Design a protein around this motif. Structure first.
Motif, mmCIF file in Angstrom:
data_model
loop_
_atom_site.group_PDB
_atom_site.id
_atom_site.type_symbol
_atom_site.label_atom_id
_atom_site.label_comp_id
_atom_site.label_asym_id
_atom_site.label_seq_id
_atom_site.Cartn_x
_atom_site.Cartn_y
_atom_site.Cartn_z
ATOM 1 N N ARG A 84 0.650 -1.307 -0.071
ATOM 2 C CA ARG A 84 -0.059 -0.142 0.076
ATOM 3 C C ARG A 84 0.856 1.219 -0.060
ATOM 4 N NH1 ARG A 84 -4.057 0.966 -2.532
ATOM 5 N NH2 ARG A 84 -5.575 -0.628 -1.344
ATOM 6 N N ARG A 125 -0.939 -5.474 4.272
ATOM 7 C CA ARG A 125 -2.177 -4.968 4.879
ATOM 8 C C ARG A 125 -2.393 -5.775 5.944
ATOM 9 N NH1 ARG A 125 -3.691 -5.030 -0.662
ATOM 10 N NH2 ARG A 125 -3.396 -2.714 -1.623
ATOM 11 N N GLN A 153 1.381 -6.229 10.529
ATOM 12 C CA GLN A 153 2.355 -4.982 11.049
ATOM 13 C C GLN A 153 3.790 -5.409 10.683
ATOM 14 O OE1 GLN A 153 0.936 -2.013 11.449
ATOM 15 N NE2 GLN A 153 -1.008 -2.796 11.233
ATOM 16 N N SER A 172 -11.591 -3.000 12.800
ATOM 17 C CA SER A 172 -10.285 -2.556 12.997
ATOM 18 C C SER A 172 -9.225 -3.877 13.352
ATOM 19 C CB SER A 172 -10.065 -1.834 14.449
ATOM 20 O OG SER A 172 -8.806 -1.010 14.452
ATOM 21 N N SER A 220 -8.378 -5.183 10.028
ATOM 22 C CA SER A 220 -7.475 -4.493 9.098
ATOM 23 C C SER A 220 -6.331 -4.243 9.816
ATOM 24 C CB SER A 220 -8.199 -3.025 8.836
ATOM 25 O OG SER A 220 -7.171 -2.055 8.254
ATOM 26 N N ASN A 221 -6.332 -4.391 11.237
ATOM 27 C CA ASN A 221 -5.076 -4.147 12.161
ATOM 28 C C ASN A 221 -4.651 -2.762 11.837
ATOM 29 O OD1 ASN A 221 -4.348 -6.207 13.660
ATOM 30 N ND2 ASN A 221 -3.470 -7.649 11.887
ATOM 31 N N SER A 222 -5.661 -1.708 12.183
ATOM 32 C CA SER A 222 -5.037 -0.427 11.911
ATOM 33 C C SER A 222 -6.327 0.480 12.250
ATOM 34 C CB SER A 222 -4.999 0.148 10.384
ATOM 35 O OG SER A 222 -4.601 1.409 10.239
ATOM 36 N N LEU A 223 -6.302 1.515 12.529
ATOM 37 C CA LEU A 223 -7.254 2.802 13.137
ATOM 38 C C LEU A 223 -7.569 3.982 11.944
ATOM 39 C CD1 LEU A 223 -6.649 2.782 16.842
ATOM 40 C CD2 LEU A 223 -8.826 1.841 15.382
ATOM 41 N N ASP A 255 -5.843 2.769 5.482
ATOM 42 C CA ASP A 255 -5.365 1.370 5.858
ATOM 43 C C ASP A 255 -6.564 0.410 5.873
ATOM 44 O OD1 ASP A 255 -2.686 2.324 6.566
ATOM 45 O OD2 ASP A 255 -3.674 3.352 7.873
ATOM 46 N N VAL A 305 -9.404 0.677 4.147
ATOM 47 C CA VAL A 305 -9.863 0.416 2.725
ATOM 48 C C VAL A 305 -8.704 -0.583 1.986
ATOM 49 C CG1 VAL A 305 -11.168 2.413 2.627
ATOM 50 C CG2 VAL A 305 -9.158 2.364 1.476
ATOM 51 N N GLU A 306 -7.467 -0.181 2.473
ATOM 52 C CA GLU A 306 -6.168 -0.986 2.095
ATOM 53 C C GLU A 306 -6.558 -2.395 2.392
ATOM 54 N N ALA A 307 -6.630 -2.935 3.449
ATOM 55 C CA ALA A 307 -6.933 -4.248 3.835
ATOM 56 C C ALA A 307 -8.101 -5.070 3.442
ATOM 57 C CB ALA A 307 -7.092 -4.437 5.229
ATOM 58 N N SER A 325 -9.155 -3.976 -0.328
ATOM 59 C CA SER A 325 -8.992 -4.080 -1.917
ATOM 60 C C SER A 325 -8.528 -5.240 -2.579
ATOM 61 C CB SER A 325 -8.324 -2.538 -2.448
ATOM 62 O OG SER A 325 -9.061 -1.434 -2.223
ATOM 63 N N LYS A 326 -8.214 -6.262 -1.626
ATOM 64 C CA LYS A 326 -7.606 -7.368 -2.179
ATOM 65 C C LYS A 326 -8.210 -8.014 -3.282
ATOM 66 C CE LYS A 326 -5.681 -10.297 0.621
ATOM 67 N NZ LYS A 326 -4.154 -10.467 0.071
ATOM 68 N N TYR A 352 -8.849 -2.745 -6.460
ATOM 69 C CA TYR A 352 -8.196 -1.343 -6.850
ATOM 70 C C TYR A 352 -6.877 -1.231 -7.673
ATOM 71 N N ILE A 353 -6.043 -2.209 -7.257
ATOM 72 C CA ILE A 353 -4.872 -2.064 -7.633
ATOM 73 C C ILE A 353 -4.807 -2.404 -9.340
ATOM 74 C CG2 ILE A 353 -2.442 -2.803 -7.775
ATOM 75 C CD1 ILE A 353 -2.467 -2.778 -4.614
ATOM 76 N N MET A 382 -5.350 -3.042 18.658
ATOM 77 C CA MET A 382 -4.144 -2.628 17.658
ATOM 78 C C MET A 382 -2.995 -3.664 17.785
ATOM 79 S SD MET A 382 -2.838 -0.889 15.363
ATOM 80 C CE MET A 382 -4.321 0.023 15.500
#
Lengths: 150, 176, 100, 130, 478, 129, 346, 116
Positions: free
Chosen positions: A21, A35, A38, G168, G171-174, G178, G180-182, G184-185, G270-271, H81
Motif C-alpha cells: 500500500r 495489509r 504489521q 479494526s 484491518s489491523n489499523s485505525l 489502511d 480500505v487498503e486491507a 481492496s484485495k 483497486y490495484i 491494535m
C-alpha cells in the motif's frame, strides 16, 4: 520480488514484491507495507556524508557491529547479528546483513544494506514479525539483493 | 512528529486563559447546571492541551470517557438536587470563604515558588537515552498498545474486577 | 514555554479544585470539584511523560488508569447520592452533623 | 547546590588502561558476571583532581541499579557490565574508573538554582559491586 | 504464567463462584456460601503456607513483590478476613439485606489489600489502594434505609477522594523529578543520573506522600474521618476496616518509605514522629469522654493504638521490624475479640451506648469475662499479651536512642487504662434497681461463639508464648 | 583539574529571561560559544530518529541564541563589524530552516542542515572572543 | 538578521482545501435534502419541490436563505449564556468528523492513525449539546423533548464501538486509508460486509437512531412531545439543527461504506485497475473523479435504503427502544467480536 | 501521525463557522419583536409554573451501567491494535478482561436494572 521501482529519487532502484500500500513512514523517498500484518517491508532513507566507498568506514565486522548494536537498537532490546556479506556490484562495496532485534515481545528481523556512492551513505531495511520470519526469509533477501544506485 | 512553530505559544496562552475562566465558572456560579457545563468546557479545553503535546491516545480517550459518559451522568444527577439561588456579594457564605481563599493561596505560593527553581530544560538533558529509543519503528498507538500488555499485565488484569464491583455496588445502591 | 507554562497551570487548577471542594454546599458540586482535582493531577502527570520517557510510556498508561478510576468513583458517588436523596428529601451537605 | 564534605581512602591502584573509549582500571575480580538484571553496587565519585561530591557510604544501603538496560551513565554501563574490549566486573569485584566527558553528562550541567555538577565535567569512580 | 498470583487467583476463583451462584441458584445459598467463601479463604491460606522461607524473587515484569516480610503481611490480611467473615455473616443476616454482594465486597477488598502488600510498581501501589477503597465506601454505607450510614459515606468518600488525590499528586511529582521511573527499587538510581535529588521538589513529594499515607491509617492530625465512620457503618465492617486497613496501610508504608527514601531519613523520621506524639495523645483524651462503644473503640483501639506500631518505623535499623510484626499479630487478636463480643451483645440486646452494659456479668458471665479479658489486654497488663507487645516495642526503640517517644507511650498507656477500667467496673455490679431493662431481658443461649472464644485465648497465651513468634519474626529484610 | 563555573543556568526559563533581568556584553559571548559545542552533540540523536529532542533542544538553543546574537554582536570590534552581522543572518536562517525540517520530520534535509548549521556557528563565535 | 521569525509570519497554512470541503458538504446537503423531498413524498404521491425552477435544485438553498433571516427570537428564560452555545457544539461535533473521512486514491485530509477512534470520540459529544439546547429554555416539550433523545443516544454507542472494533481487528489499523487498503484485495469477495455481516447489521440498525432516525414516528405524530427540542429555535438555529441531522446521516453512511465496503475500490480490486493495460497516461483526474464516483454511490445506496425504511416501520417508542438497544444489540455485538477473535486467530 | 496542522486549521475554521453564522444572521436581522417573548411554544394556554419533572429513577440506572461498561472500549483499543504485533498472550488476557464484564452484564440483566 515482482515489481521494480526506481522510485524516481534519482538514486536507488530496488524491488518490492506485491500490493504494498506504499506508506510514508519516516525514511522519506520510499516505503512499502502489507495489509494484514504489521512490521513490514522496505523503507530507505538518505543522509549526507561526504566520505568515499563504504570500505573506508572501517573493517566490515566492526563498523557493522558499532551500528547494529548502537543505532539499530534500543536499551530495552537485545540484538543478534547473523551472517554478513559484501556485494561489490559496481565497486560501491555494499554491506548486506541479516540481524535480529529481540524485545520483550517483538523480536523483529532485518536484511539491512548500505551504499557510499555519490549519495553518501543511504541505507535500506526489511522486516517482519518473528512468528512468521522463517517462512518468507528467502523472499526478502532477493529484495535486498536489488540495491544499486545511479 | 512535531508542531508548526511559533504558533505554539499562542495556542498555549489561549487555552490557558480559557481554562482559567472555565475553572472560575466551575467554582463561582451557584446554578449547578451552569457549573457542570463549565466543567465540560474545562475538560474539552484540557483535552486540547493533551492533544497539543504529541500524546494522542491519552487525549482522545480522555475526551471520550469524560467529555462523554461522566458529564452526561453528572447532568442526570443534577436532576435530583432542588433549591438553588443562594446568597451572593463577595464571599456569599461565612468567613470560611476568606479562610479558604487564604490557605489555598498559601498552598499556591508554596508550590508556585517551588516550581520556578528547577531547570526543567536542564532536567531534560540529563536523560538523553530514555526518549532516544522509539523501539526502532513504531507509531503512537502501538507504543501504548504493546507496552500496556508486555509489562503492565497485573494492573490491567486487576482493573476489570474493580469495574465489575463498582457496577454491582452502584446498581445495588441506587436501586431502592 | 511548553514544558514550563503547563505546570504553572497545574497548581493554578489543583488549588482551585481543593477550594471548590471545601466551600462546596451541594453534593454534586463537591463531586465536580473532586473530578477537577483528579484531572489537574492527570495533566500534571502527562507532560512529564512527553518530555522524557518515550521509549516505554510510563505516564500515559498511568493517566489512563487514573481516568478509569475517576470514572468508577464518579459512578459510585452518584449512586450513593441516589440513596441519600431517597432517605432525606434534600442533599444539603453541611446540614447533616448527626454523627459527631 | 554544590559540593559538600566527606572522608575516605582510595586503595591506590595501578596505571589506568584507557582502551580507546574511557579510562579503565581493575583492582580485584572475585566471583561471577552479571546479566542484564538488577545489581547492587557501592560507589564513591570524585572530581577530576581531588574533590568528592557523593559516596554511597554517605547513606544507608548502597544503591541498586540496572546493568544492561540504559538507565545509567554510559561510562558506567560500559565499565561495569563490560564494554567493547573490557571484561565485566565479577560479583564481588572492585574497579576504578575515570570517565571522559563524552560518556558522561556532556557539556551542560544539571541545575537546581545551582548546578550540582560543574558544567562539562569529567569525573572519577571507585566502583565495588556487592 | 506464574504461581505468585495463585494465592490471589484462588481468591478470584472463589469470587467468580460467589457471583455465579446467585445468578444460577435459587435459594439454597444462605448457609451454603457462608462456608463456601471460608473454603476459598482457607485454601488461599494453605497456598500461602507453601511460600514460607522463600526468596526475594521479583514479580511479573517486576511489578508487585515476593519476599518473606511481604509474605507475612499477605498471610496476616487473610487471617483477619477469615476471622472477620463469620462476624459479618449473621449481623447482615439479621437486617434482611442481600448477603451475596456483601461477601463479594469483603472478598474483593481483601484481594485489594493482599495485592497492596507488595506492589513495588508505583502504579499497582496506586490501583490497589483504590481496589481497597472503592470497595470501602460501599460496605461503610451498605445499610441504605439507615440515616447515619449515609453520613458515614459522604464524610468518607469526600475524604478518601481528597487524600488519594494528594497521594497521587505526590507520586506524579516523584515520577517527574526522578527523570522518569516507576519501579520502587529503581528510584535512587534515576534520581541520581538526574541530579535533581538534593533539590526542592523531593521535599514536596515526600510530604504529599506521607499525608496520603497518614490518612489511610489515621494518625491524629488527620484522624477526623475515623471517629464518625466507625459509628455510622455496621459494626462488622467497622472491625474489618479497623483491622485490615491498618494492616495493609502499615505494610505499604514501610516499603514505600524505606526503599525509595534512603537519603531523606532525617527529614521523615522526624515527620512521622510528629504524627506519633500526637496520635497517642489526641486519640486518648477524647476516648475518655466517650459514651458510645463503637466511637470509644475508634478513639482508643485505632486513634491511639496506631501509635506504637509507628513507634519503631522511625527507630528501625532492621532490628525492630520483628517487633512491629509481633505487635500487629497481637493487636489483630486483641481487637477482633472485643469486636466479636460487641457484635454479639449488640445483636442480642439492641443498644450500643455504654450505660447499658451494666449487670451483664450476672445475666451471662462468659461473655462479660471474654470481653473483660480482651479489654484488659488492650490496656496492656503484665500477664496478658498487650503488655509484652508494648514492652518489646519499647525495649527496641529505647535501644535505638530516641527517648521522647517511649515515655509518652507509657504515659498515654497509663492514661488509656482509665476507660477500660471504667467499662470493666460497669460490668461487675448487682444494684438491681440500676440496670436498665435491656440486660434484664437477655435470653443468653456456632460461628460467633467459636470466633470469640478462639480469638480471646490468643489474647492471653501468645503474650507468654512469644518465643517462637519472636524467633520467626526476625527474618524480615525489606 | 578543579570544578567549573555554572554561569547562569539555574532557572526555569520563566525566572530566566523574564524575572532575573541581566545580560552583559562578553557574557553572551559565553552562551554563543556554548551553543556551538552544545549543538554538536545531537549528531547521534539525528542518526537514530529521535524526533522529540531535535525539536526541544533546537527551540531552546535558538531562543537563547536569538537574543545573544543581538547583544553580543554589539560589543565585537565596532569599527569593522558588518560581517559579524552578515553572519547572524546565516546562523539564524539555517536554524530557522532546521526548525522547519524537523517539524514535518525529514531526514535528508534535516541532516544536510545539521552540518551546515554548525559549520556556520563556528564562525559567528569566531568574530567574537 | 532574523529578529523574531523570517519565514514564520503567516505563510505556512493555506485554507483553500478546507473551504472546498465546506462547499462540497453544503452541496451534498442540498443533494440529500432533494433526495428526501423528491423520493419520500413521491413514492405514491406528486412530484417533490417543483416550481423552484425546473426542479428543487434551488429549493434547498432557498430554504436555507429563508431560515437565515427569520428573526431569531431568543426566549426570556435562558439566554445567550447557553442558548447560542447549544447548537455550536452540535454542529462542531459532526463538522470536525469530516477530517479523517477519505474520498479516493490519495485524497485523505490527514493520515491520523487514530482516525476512526477520533470519529467515535467525536460522535459521543452531540448528546451534551442536545441536553444543553433542550435545557437552554425552561418550559417542557424541550426539556424532556431533548432529554429523551440525549438518553436514548447513549444506549447505542456501545454497539457502534463493538462493530468498529470488529473491523479494526480485521484491518489491523485505525486509519480509514489502511482499512480500505486491507479491503481492496479480492475486489468484492474481501469486502468486510461479507466477512462480518453480523457486525454490519448491528451498525446499520444503530445508525438509524444514532442520527435521529426516526425522531418522530409519523408525519402527524410529533417528536414525542411537540417537537424535538427545537421548538423555540426559529431561524438559523433550526437551520443548524437540520444541518447537523443530515450531516450525522451523511457521516454514518460514509463510514459504513468506507468500513464494510470497498472505500474507493471498484468491484475488481483497486490495484488491478492499472495492471491489465500495461500502461497508464493520464489516470490522475480519472482516478480522482472515479474515487468520488465509486464511493459516493455506495453511501447513496444506504441513503436510499434509509429513505425506504422511513416508510416501512413504525419507529419504536422509548419504552422499546432502550430494550432493543440494550438487551438485543449488545449480546450479538459482543458475540461477533468473540467469534472474530478466533476467526482472526490465524 | 506526522502533521496535525490540517487538524488545527480545521478546528479553528469549524469553530469560527458557528459564531460567523450567528454574527452574519445578527447583522442582517430585524431589531424588532418586543412582544411577550417570555413563553416558549406549543402551549397555547399561556401556561407558566412547575418543577420536579424528573423521572431520573429509571434513566439513571441506564446512565450508570453505560458509564461503567464504556471503559471496556478504551482498554480494548490498545489491545485491538496490538494483536498480531505481539503473540497470543494478549488474546487470553483480553478474553479474561471482556469476560469479567460479560459476567457483570449478565448480572445487571438478571437482577432488574435495564427496565422500561
Amino acid at each position: 520480488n515482482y515489481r521494480s521501482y526506481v522510485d524516481a529519487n534519482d538514486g536507488y532502484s530496488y524491488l518490492y514484491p506485491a500490493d504494498w500500500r506504499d506508506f510514508d513512514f519516516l525514511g522519506h523517498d520510499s516505503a512499502f507495507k502489507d495489509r494484514n500484518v504489521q512490521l513490514q517491508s522496505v523503507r530507505v532513507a538518505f543522509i549526507p556524508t561526504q566520505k568515499t566507498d563504504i570500505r573506508d568506514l572501517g573493517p566490515m565486522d566492526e563498523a557493522i557491529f558499532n551500528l547494529v548494536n548502537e543505532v539499530y537498537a534500543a536499551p530495552n532490546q537485545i540484538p543478534t547479528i547473523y551472517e554478513m556479506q559484501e556485494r561489490t556490484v559496481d565497486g560501491r562495496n555494499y554491506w548486506t546483513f541479516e540481524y535480529d532485534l529481540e524485545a520483550p515481545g517483538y523480536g523483529v528481523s532485518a536484511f539491512a544494506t548500505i551504499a557510499i556512492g555519490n549519495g553518501r551513505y543511504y541505507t535500506l531495511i526489511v522486516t517482519a514479525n518473528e512468528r512468521r520470519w522463517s517462512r518468507l526469509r528467502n523472499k526478502l533477501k532477493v529484495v535486498a539483493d536489488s540495491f544499486k544506485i545511479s | 512528529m512535531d508542531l508548526p512553530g511559533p504558533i505554539h505559544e499562542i495556542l498555549m496562552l489561549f487555552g490557558e486563559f480559557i481554562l482559567l475562566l472555565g475553572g472560575l465558572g466551575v467554582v463561582l456560579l451557584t446554578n449547578p447546571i451552569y457549573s457542570a457545563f463549565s466543567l465540560g468546557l474545562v475538560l474539552v479545553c484540557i483535552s486540547l492541551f493533551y492533544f497539543l503535546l504529541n500524546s494522542y491516545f491519552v487525549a482522545v480517550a480522555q475526551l471520550l470517557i469524560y467529555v462523554g459518559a461522566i458529564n452526561v451522568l453528572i447532568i442526570f444527577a443534577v436532576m435530583f438536587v432542588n433549591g438553588s439561588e443562594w446568597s451572593k456579594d463577595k464571599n456569599y457564605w461565612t468567613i470560611g470563604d476568606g479562610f479558604t481563599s487564604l490557605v489555598c493561596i498559601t498552598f499556591v505560593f508554596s508550590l508556585m515558588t517551588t516550581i520556578p527553581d528547577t531547570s526543567w530544560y536542564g532536567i531534560l538533558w540529563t536523560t538523553r537515552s530514555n526518549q532516544i529509543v522509539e523501539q526502532g519503528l513504531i507509531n503512537n498507538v502501538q507504543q501504548i498498545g504493546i507496552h500496556l500488555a508486555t509489562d503492565f499485565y497485573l494492573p490491567f488484569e486487576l482493573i476489570s474486577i474493580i469495574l465489575l464491583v463498582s457496577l454491582i455496588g452502584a446498581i445495588t445502591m441506587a436501586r431502592q | 514555554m511548553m514544558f514550563e507554562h503547563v505546570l504553572f497551570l497545574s497548581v493554578y487548577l489543583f488549588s482551585i479544585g481543593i477550594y471548590g471542594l471545601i466551600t462546596s454546599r451541594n453534593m454534586v458540586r463537591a463531586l465536580i470539584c473532586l473530578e477537577l482535582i483528579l484531572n489537574s493531577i492527570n495533566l500534571n502527570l502527562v507532560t512529564f511523560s512527553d518530555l522524557f520517557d518515550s521509549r516505554q510510556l510510563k505516564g500515559d498508561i498511568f493517566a489512563i488508569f487514573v481516568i478509569a478510576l475517576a470514572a468508577a468513583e464518579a459512578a459510585i458517588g452518584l449512586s450513593i447520592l441516589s440513596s441519600i436523596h431517597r432517605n432525606r428529601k434534600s442533599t444539603r451537605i453541611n446540614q447533616s452533623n448527626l454523627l459527631n | 547546590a554544590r559540593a559538600a564534605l566527606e572522608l575516605h581512602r582510595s586503595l591506590c591502584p595501578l596505571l589506568v588502561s584507557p582502551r580507546e573509549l574511557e579510562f579503565l582500571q581493575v583492582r580485584d575480580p572475585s566471583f561471577c558476571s552479571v546479566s542484564m538484571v538488577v545489581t547492587q553496587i557501592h560507589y564513591t565519585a570524585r572530581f577530576p583532581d581531588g574533590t568528592v561530591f557523593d559516596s554511597s557510604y554517605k547513606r544507608g544501603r548502597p544503591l541498586t541499579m540496572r546493568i544492561g538496560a540504559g538507565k545509567i551513565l554510559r561510562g558506567l554501563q560500559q565499565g561495569i557490565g563490560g564494554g567493547g574490549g573490557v571484561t565485566p566486573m565479577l560479583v564481588g569485584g572492585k574497579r576504578k574508573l575515570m570517565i571522559p566527558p563524552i560518556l558522561a553528562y556532556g557539556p551542560e550541567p544539571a541545575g537546581c538554582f545551582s548546578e550540582a555538577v560543574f558544567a562539562q565535567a569529567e569525573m572519577n569512580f571507585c566502583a565495588l559491586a556487592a | 504464567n506464574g504461581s505468585f498470583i495463585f494465592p490471589e487467583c484462588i481468591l478470584i476463583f472463589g469470587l467468580i463462584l460467589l457471583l455465579m451462584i446467585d445468578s444460577t441458584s435459587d435459594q439454597k445459598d444462605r448457609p451454603w456460601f457462608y462456608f463456601i467463601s471460608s473454603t476459598s479463604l482457607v485454601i488461599s491460606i494453605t497456598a500461602l503456607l507453601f511460600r514460607w522461607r522463600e526468596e526475594p524473587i521479583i514479580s511479573f515484569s517486576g511489578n508487585f513483590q515476593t519476599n518473606n516480610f511481604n509474605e507475612i503481611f499477605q498471610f496476616l490480611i487473610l487471617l483477619c478476613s477469615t476471622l472477620c467473615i463469620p462476624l459479618s455473616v449473621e449481623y447482615i443476616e439479621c437486617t434482611e439485606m442481600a448477603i451475596t454482594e456483601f461477601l463479594l465486597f469483603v472478598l474483593t477488598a481483601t484481594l485489594g489489600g493482599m495485592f497492596l502488600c507488595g506492589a513495588n510498581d508505583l502504579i499497582t501501589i496506586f490501583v490497589a489502594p483504590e481496589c481497597f477503597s472503592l470497595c470501602s465506601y460501599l460496605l461503610s454505607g451498605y445499610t441504605k434505609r439507615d440515616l447515619r450510614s449515609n453520613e458515614a459515606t459522604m464524610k468518607y468518600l469526600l475524604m478518601g477522594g481528597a487524600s488519594s488525590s494528594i497521594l497521587v499528586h505526590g507520586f506524579s511529582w516523584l515520577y517527574g523529578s526522578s527523570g522518569g521511573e516507576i519501579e520502587l527499587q529503581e528510584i535512587v538510581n534515576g534520581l541520581i543520573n538526574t541530579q535533581m535529588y538534593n533539590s526542592p521538589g523531593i521535599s514536596i513529594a515526600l510530604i504529599s506522600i506521607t499525608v496520603g499515607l497518614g490518612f489511610k491509617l489515621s494518625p491524629a492530625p488527620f484522624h477526623q474521618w475515623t471517629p464518625d465512620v466507625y459509628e455510622g457503618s455496621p459494626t462488622p465492617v467497622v472491625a474489618f476496616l479497623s483491622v485490615t486497613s491498618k494492616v495493609a496501610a502499615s505494610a505499604s508504608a514501610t516499603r514505600i518509605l524505606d526503599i525509595p527514601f534512603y537519603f531523606s531519613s532525617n527529614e521523615w523520621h522526624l515527620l512521622l514522629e510528629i504524627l506519633a506524639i500526637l496520635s497517642m495523645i489526641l486519640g486518648n483524651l477524647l476516648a475518655i469522654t466517650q459514651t458510645s462503644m463503637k466511637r470509644m473503640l475508634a478513639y482508643s483501639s485505632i486513634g491511639q493504638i496506631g501509635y506504637v506500631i509507628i513507634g519503631i518505623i522511625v527507630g528501625d535499623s532492621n532490628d525492630g521490624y520483628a517487633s512491629m510484626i509481633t505487635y500487629m499479630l497481637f493487636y489483630i487478636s486483641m481487637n477482633l475479640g472485643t469486636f466479636a463480643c460487641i457484635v454479639l451483645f449488640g445483636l442480642r440486646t439492641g443498644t450500643d451506648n455504654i450505660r447499658d452494659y451494666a449487670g451483664l456479668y450476672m445475666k451471662d458471665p462468659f461473655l462479660a469475662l471474654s470481653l473483660a479479658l480482651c479489654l484488659l489486654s488492650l490496656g496492656g497488663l503484665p500477664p496478658l499479651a498487650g503488655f509484652f507487645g508494648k514492652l518489646y516495642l519499647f525495649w527496641c526503640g529505647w535501644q535505638a536512642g530516641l527517648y521522647f517517644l517511649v515515655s509518652i507511650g507509657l504515659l498515654t498507656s497509663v492514661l488509656s487504662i482509665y476507660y477500660y477500667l471504667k467499662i470493666i467496673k460497669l460490668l461487675m455490679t448487682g444494684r438491681n434497681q440500676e440496670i436498665t431493662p435491656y440486660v434484664r431481658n437477655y435470653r443468653r443461649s456456632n460461628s460467633i461463639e467459636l470466633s470469640m472464644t478462639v480469638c480471646v485465648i490468643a489474647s492471653t497465651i501468645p503474650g507468654i508464648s512469644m518465643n517462637p513468634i519472636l524467633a520467626i519474626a526476625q527474618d524480615t529484610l525489606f | 583539574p578543579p570544578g567549573t563555573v555554572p554561569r547562569w543556568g539555574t532557572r526555569s526559563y520563566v525566572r530566566e529571561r523574564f524575572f532575573e533581568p541581566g545580560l552583559t556584553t562578553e557574557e553572551a559571548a559565553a552562551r554563543i560559544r556554548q551553543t556551538a559545542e552544545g549543538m554538536r552533540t545531537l549528531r547521534p540523536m539525528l542518526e537514530t530518529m529521535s524526533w522529540k529532542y531535535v525539536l526541544f533542544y533546537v527551540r531552546l538553543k535558538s531562543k537563547y541564541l536569538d537574543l545573544d546574537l543581538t547583544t553580543a554582536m554589539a560589543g565585537v570590534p565596532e569599527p569593522r563589524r558588518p560581517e559579524y552581522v552578515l553572519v547572524a543572518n546565516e546562523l539564524v536562517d539555517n536554524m530557522t530552516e532546521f526548525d522547519r525540517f524537523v517539524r514535518t520530520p525529514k531526514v535528508y534535509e534535516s541532516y544536510l542542515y545539521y552540518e551546515k548549521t554548525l559549520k556556520s556557528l563556528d564562525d559567528v563565535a569566531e568574530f567574537l572572543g | 538578521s532574523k529578529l523574531e521569525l523570517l519565514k514564520e509570519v503567516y505563510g505556512l497554512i493555506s485554507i483553500l482545501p478546507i473551504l472546498t470541503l465546506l462547499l462540497g458538504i453544503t452541496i451534498e446537503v442540498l443533494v440529500i435534502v432533494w433526495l428526501e423531498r423528491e423520493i419520500s413524498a413521491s413514492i405514491q404521491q406528486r412530484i417533490g419541490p417543483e416550481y423552484a425552477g425546473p426542479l428543487g435544485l434551488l429549493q434547498a438553498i432557498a430554504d436555507g436563505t429563508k431560515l437565515l433571516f427569520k428573526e431569531d427570537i431568543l426566549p426570556s428564560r435562558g439566554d445567550i449564556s447557553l442558548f447560542s452555545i447549544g447548537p455550536s457544539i452540535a454542529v462542531i461535533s459532526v463538522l470536525l468528523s469530516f477530517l479523517v473521512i477519505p474520498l479516493g486514491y490519495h485524497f485523505v485530509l490527514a493520515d491520523l492513525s487514530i482516525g476512526v477512534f477520533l470519529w467515535i470520540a467525536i460522535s459521543s459529544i452531540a448528546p451534551i449539546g442536545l441536553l444543553m439546547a433542550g435545557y437552554s429554555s425552561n418550559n417542557k416539550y424541550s426539556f424532556l423533548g431533548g432529554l429523551r433523545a440525549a438518553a436514548q443516544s447513549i444506549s447505542y454507542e456501545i454497539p457502534l464501538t463493538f462493530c468498529v472494533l470488529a473491523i479494526s481487528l480485521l484491518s489491523n489499523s485505525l486509519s480509514t486509508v489502511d482499512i480500505v487498503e486491507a479491503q481492496s484485495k479480492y475486489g468484492f469477495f474481501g469486502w468486510n460486509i461479507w466477512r462480518q455481516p453480523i457486525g454490519f447489521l448491528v451498525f446499520l440498525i444503530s445508525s438509524l437512531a444514532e442520527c435521529e432516525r426516526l425522531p418522530f414516528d409519523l408525519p402527524e405524530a410529533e417528536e414525542e412531545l411537540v417537537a424535538g427540542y427545537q421548538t423555540e429555535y426559529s431561524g438559523i438555529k433550526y437551520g443548524l439543527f437540520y444541518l447537523v441531522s443530515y450531516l450525522n446521516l451523511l457521516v454514518s453512511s460514509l463510514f459504513v461504506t468506507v468500513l464494510y465496503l470497498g472505500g474507493w475500490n471498484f468491484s475488481i480490486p483497486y490495484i488491478s485497475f492499472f495492471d491489465f493495460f500495461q500502461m497508464n497516461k493520464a489516470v490522475g483526474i480519472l482516478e480522482m473523479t472515479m474515487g468520488i464516483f465509486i464511493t459516493l454511490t455506495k453511501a447513496y445506496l444506504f441513503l436510499f435504503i434509509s429513505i425506504t425504511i422511513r416508510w416501512t416501520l413504525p419507529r419504536m417508542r422509548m419504552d422499546q427502544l432502550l430494550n432493543l438497544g440494550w438487551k438485543f444489540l449488545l449480546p450479538i455485538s459482543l458475540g461477533n467480536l468473540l467469534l472474530t477473535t478466533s476467526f482472526q486467530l490465524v | 501521525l506526522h502533521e496535525y496542522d490540517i487538524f488545527w486549521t480545521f478546528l479553528i475554521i469549524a469553530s469560527l463557522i458557528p459564531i460567523l453564522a450567528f454574527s452574519i444572521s445578527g447583522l442582517l436581522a430585524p431589531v424588532s419583536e418586543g412582544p411577550e417573548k417570555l413563553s416558549s411554544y406549543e402551549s397555547g394556554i399561556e401556561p407558566m409554573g412547575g418543577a420536579w419533572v424528573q423521572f431520573r429513577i429509571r434513566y439513571y440506572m441506564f446512565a450508570l451501567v453505560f458509564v461503567v461498561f464504556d471503559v471496556e472500549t478504551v482498554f480494548l483499543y490498545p489491545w485491538a491494535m496490538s494483536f498480531d504485533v505481539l503473540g497470543v498472550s494478549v488474546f487470553i488476557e483480553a478474553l479474561i478482561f471482556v469476560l469479567i464484564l460479560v459476567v457483570g452484564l449478565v448480572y445487571a440483566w438478571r437482577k432488574g436494572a435495564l427496565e422500561w
